[PDB]
Design a protein around this ligand. Sequence first.
Ligand SMILES: O=C(O)[C@H]1[C@H]2CC[C@H](CC2)[C@@H]1Nc1nc(-c2c[nH]c3ncc(F)cc23)ncc1F
Ligand SMILES: O=C(O)[C@H]1[C@H]2CC[C@H](CC2)[C@@H]1Nc1nc(-c2c[nH]c3ncc(F)cc23)ncc1F
Length: 171
Amino acid sequence: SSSFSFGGFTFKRTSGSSVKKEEEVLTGNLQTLKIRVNEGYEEFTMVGRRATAILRKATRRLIQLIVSGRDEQSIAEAIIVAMVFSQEDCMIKAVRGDLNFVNRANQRLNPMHQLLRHFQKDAKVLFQNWGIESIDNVMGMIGILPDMTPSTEMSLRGIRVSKMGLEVLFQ
Ligand SMILES: O=C(O)[C@H]1[C@H]2CC[C@H](CC2)[C@@H]1Nc1nc(-c2c[nH]c3ncc(F)cc23)ncc1F
Ligand SMILES: O=C(O)[C@H]1[C@H]2CC[C@H](CC2)[C@@H]1Nc1nc(-c2c[nH]c3ncc(F)cc23)ncc1F
């Protein structure tokens, strides 16, 4: 509808709709989180200083992320935000230790920001447990492995790196 900020990226919804439904989820540390799950199919653009992306998602499901970034670190930053934003069970179950993050005032962060801060600290467990898949047509986009190196054979599930800037899909 209108643009919002998450993880250093401006997001804008380009199509679709969702409704919030409260769900209780267990983390990989058996901590209960109360998350307002977005239910529906939606498409987004993401813009950051060093990466842009197209995000297509459904209820707790990253269907596809196409990322264009300056370097491996910048691409990884966009992927992490997209994986948290997806609200996938896979991402919740990749949490290690308990989440009790607070802001500058002593106020507990909301669960989505708990998750974001967690995986922005270290995404290695998230990347290693997300899943990989074989990729075929590499003419327009290539794969990225859990170690953030390129591949023309495999990729993180639903993740592709564009061989071009993304104005063509933003238009
Ligand atoms: O425009 C904004 O509000 C923000 C949001 C969207 C992208 C940046 C980070 C978040 C942006 N802020 C700024 N970007 C930039 C900027 C430099 N090179 C870039 N390349 C791509 C890009 F996209 C933004 C930038 N410079 C100063 C900024 F202040
Ligand atoms: O839901 C919220 O509390 C906030 C915080 C956590 C993620 C977004 C940015 C901060 C969120 N804000 C917004 N989310 C959404 C939104 C649509 N579909 C989604 N699927 C998963 C998700 F996670 C957030 C969304 N749209 C507009 C927003 F403005």
